Structure formats: C-alpha cells, structure tokens
C-alpha cells in the first residue's frame, strides 16, 4: 500500500495508472505536479524523462504509464486482471497500447498547443488513430474483447479530451465515431474509470484558457 | 515450431527477435525482406506499420521487436528466461528497452542516411544514449545484472553498427566506451548473439555503398 503517484490531473497517460490502481483496490497517495514547476521528487525519481506520471512504490520509481499498468497488474494479478492470460493476446494488447503511444506522442500536445499547419498535421494523425482504433474495436464490447483490458485503459483517458479536440481543433469525433462513444460509455460504468477521468468541460476550460493566453 | 521471421539482415531490431528465438532453441524459417520491395506477406501481416521484423507464428503476426521478444519468452519461459521474475526488475528492463527504442528511432536512420545538421543532431542523440546506457550498466556484467537479459538483447544488435557509426558519422565509440565494448564481447560469447549479429565490416560496406550512391 506504500504508493505515491506523481501526476497531472488532465494527463490521459496518468489516468491509465490511476485506473490500474483503482482496479486493484489499492489505496495510494496522489500528488499533483505543476508542469511548469516540477517537484524535486519528480526530477529525482524520473531523471531520464522528467515527466509524469511517476509511480513510486516503497520509494522506488516506475516510469512510463503502460509499464506502470503492467507492473501493477503483475503485483496483483488476481484482482481484476488487466492483461490477457494468453501470450498471443497479450502481445496484441501490448501492440495496440504501443500504437496509441507512438501515434499520440505529438498530437497529445499539438492538437491544443498549435495552430496552422502543425495543428492540421496533428489533426490528420489523430483522426487516423481514431479510425484505426475504431476498426480494431469492431463490434466488440471492449478492445479487450468481452472484458475491459489493457488497451481500454490505454485509450479511455482520451475520452475526457474529445470535447476539447472538437472545440480547439475543429474535429468531429462524437458524431463520426459512435462505436467509440458507446465504448467510452461502457468503460465509464467502472468506478476506476469514473474516478480517474476529469470532467471534460473542466479539461476544455483549462485548455482553452491556456490556448487563448499563449496564442490570442 | 511453426515460425516465420520476416526480417532484414542488418536490422538491429530484427536481431533481437533472432536472438530470442535462438535463446529458446527454436527452429524457425528466416525470410529476408527487400526494404525497397516489401513482400505481399509483409504488407498483409504488418498492415499498420509495414515494417520488419514481423514474427509469424501459426500464421498469426506479432509486431514490434520488443513485443516479439516478450512473446517468445512467455511462450517458452523456462528455457533461458529473458525477463526477470521480479515485477519491479521487469518494469525496469521494459523501461530501458523502451528508452532505447524511443531514442534510436530517428538516429537508426539519420546516422548513416543524412549529413550536415540532421546527422549532427542524430550524433548528439546517439552519444547521449551511449552515455546513459553506459551509466546504467555501471560495473555489472550485463544490463540484466549477473545474467544476459531483455535490455542486453535490446541493445546488442547495435554493436554490429558501431564500426559504421564511427566511420560514416565520425563518432568515437570503441575508445570512448570500453565498458560497453567489454559488455558486447561478453554477449558475443552466446551462440544466439554470435549467430544473430552480422559481420560489422559487411554492415559498413553495405551502408557506405548505399550512402556513397545516395549522396556522393
Ligand atoms: Mg482480460
Ligand atoms: Mg534474467
């Protein structure tokens, strides 16, 4: 139970680790990091990347959200198992989490922080992700099949940003991807997800205010 | 034993999967892909990224080299185990493999394919990787500690390119990082590594000829 999570409230990546901890019914200390004034603990525990989320367990750091989720799953594998038991299914889940990380590394920032050609580039990339994930989900209840799993955790945090993407990047998500909206609604019925995701209007307000200040 | 590996002889990433298969004493079919004329099988099995290496097991694809290595380890966990048994050690091994992938994604190409400012940028990034990995290795025999492990597999393929990096990018590796040279020599004593890594002079000749043709 000796766990600290250094995180940023609106981080879709940190939300993954918040969800995994709640899935295991783990009590932990959440600490909010100021992204423009990172704590001494954060820089000490994540000297390589200096980024949130940072999971600290018995004073030892675990970095990278998908690696944190797997560490939590391996620590408590019998309570709400996150990864599949089958090796091949496991590899597919890791592949799609990796896909999300690779393809959202830039858009996660440029979608709200840029304009013009750099924001258009990010819009194109993110729409491609939504289409690809929508096709991979198909007609299943979850990316994990019949049960909520690793890939669901890997993407559900982005739902809290859909409203922001539609408004600051002139994207159409809710009306174009009803299967993803329905999937998000299924996931939100889990207490872990409901606790982890911030209000989407709060996200938008925060991002708009920041946007409007840094670029007019 | 029903395994096909679609790979490129000089791919340091594909070398990881070659090593993992040999570590498990698995007989498999290796197929060489022409990177400028990718096979129909490759595009079929890896439609998302269209890149090697692609591992095909009972006709099902597994993409991304570090994910392939873990899949092979989980299929045959008792023969030459690659990942640690301890969850925390496991997370650290995954973190350093992820670090290597993230920081070499661009240099793996720009170091030999570019010149001027883009090659200098890649040189700076790769030197930072070598320094960081050298510090993480410390005085241990392997990145995995007392035994060859995931991070060793994740980086040992780059040794076959050290000569190329020194010659085409005017880097100094062998004389600046004796601990990494000694580590590489330890790893090369394993049959899996000796079989997987191509001759470093053959790599250089191939890369120089390609370089000299595409840019004078
Ligand atoms: Mg499951
Ligand atoms: Mg080991």
UniProtKB/Swiss-Prot annotation, chains A, B:
Which keywords does this Swiss-Prot/TrEMBL entry list? Cytoplasm, Detoxification, Transferase
Localization annotation: Cytoplasm, Cytosol
- GO molecular-function annotation terms? glutathione transferase activity
Primary localisation category: cytoplasm
Q: Which Pfam families match?
A: GST_C, GST_N
The record's GO CC annotations read: cytoplasm; cytosol; mitochondrion
Q: Taking every annotated instance into account, which residue ranges of this chain make up the domain GST N-terminal?
A: 1-80
GO BP annotation list: glutathione metabolic process; toxin catabolic process
What CDD domains does the record point to?
Answer: GST_C_Tau, GST_N_Tau
Q: Does the keyword Acyltransferase apply?
A: no
UniProt EC number? 2.5.1.18
- Enumerate the residues binding glutathione: 11-12, 37-38, 51-52, 64-65
Can the keyword Transferase be found in this entry's annotation?
Answer: yes
The chemistry this enzyme catalyses reads:
RX + glutathione = an S-substituted glutathione + a halide anion + H(+)
Q: According to its UniProt entry, what is the function of this protein?
A: May be involved in the conjugation of reduced glutathione to a wide number of exogenous and endogenous hydrophobic electrophiles and have a detoxification role against certain herbicides.
Family per similarity comment: Belongs to the GST superfamily. Tau family.
Q: What is this protein called?
A: Glutathione S-transferase U23
What is the organism field in this record? Arabidopsis thaliana (Mouse-ear cress)
Gene from which the chain derives: GSTU23
């Amino acid at each position: 139970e000796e766990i600290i999570l250094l995180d940023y409230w609106a981080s879709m990546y940190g939300m993954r680790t918040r969800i995994a901890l709640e899935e295991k019914k783990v009590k932990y200390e959440y600490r909010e990091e100021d992204l423009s004034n990172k704590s001494p603990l954060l820089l000490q525990m994540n000297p390589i990347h200096k980024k949130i989320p940072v999971l600290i367990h018995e004073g030892k750091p675990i970095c990278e959200s998908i690696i944190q989720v797997q560490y939590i799953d391996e620590l408590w594998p019998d309570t709400n198992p996150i990864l599949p038991s089958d090796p091949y299914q496991r590899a597919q889940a890791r592949f799609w989490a990796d896909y999300i990380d690779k393809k959202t590394y830039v858009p996660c920032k440029a979608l709200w922080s840029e304009s013009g050609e750099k924001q258009e580039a990010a819009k194109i990339e993110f729409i491609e992700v939504l289409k690809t994930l929508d096709s991979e989900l198909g007609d299943k209840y979850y990316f994990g099949g019949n049960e909520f799993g690793l890939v669901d955790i890997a993407f559900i945090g982005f739902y809290s940003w859909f409203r922001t993407y539609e408004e600051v990047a002139n994207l159409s998500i809710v009306l174009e991807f009803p299967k993803l909206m329905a999937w998000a609604q299924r996931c939100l019925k889990r207490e872990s997800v409901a606790k982890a995701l911030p209000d989407s209007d709060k996200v938008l307000k925060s991002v708009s205010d920041h946007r409007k200040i840094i670029l007019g």
